[PDB]
Amino acid sequence: GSSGSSGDYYQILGVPRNASQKEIKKAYYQLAKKYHPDTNKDDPKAKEKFSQLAEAYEVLSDEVKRKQYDAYGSGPSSG
């Protein structure tokens, strides 16, 4: 129960583990625009957040990456 999870793309984007291709796409853009580097001038942390998004979608949007990630999507990081 560590306050603040990092790694689960589903969380980064804000979609359920059983999201839909449509939701994944729509969400990705929704978040991206929200955490845009342009609007975020005095936000050096954002630049990092946005990067996470793109990477998240790339995998999800991809059936291959999503499938593999679906099984290899575990957080063994002690907690």
Residue 59 domain flag: yes
- How many domains does the chain divide into? 1
Q: How was this structure determined?
A: NMR
Residue 46 domain flag: yes
| Helix, strand, coil fractions of the chain, as percent rounded to 5 | 55, 0, 45
Residue 64 domain flag: yes
φ/ψ region of 74 (left if φ > 0, alpha if ψ in -120 to 50, else beta) reads beta
Residue 1 domain flag: no
In whole angstroms, how far apart are CA 1 and each of 4, 49, 58, 74?
A: 9, 23, 28, 15
What is the rounded CA–CA span in Å between residue 69 and residue 44? Answer: 29
Residue 2 domain flag: no
- By residue range, what is the domain housing residue 72? 7-79
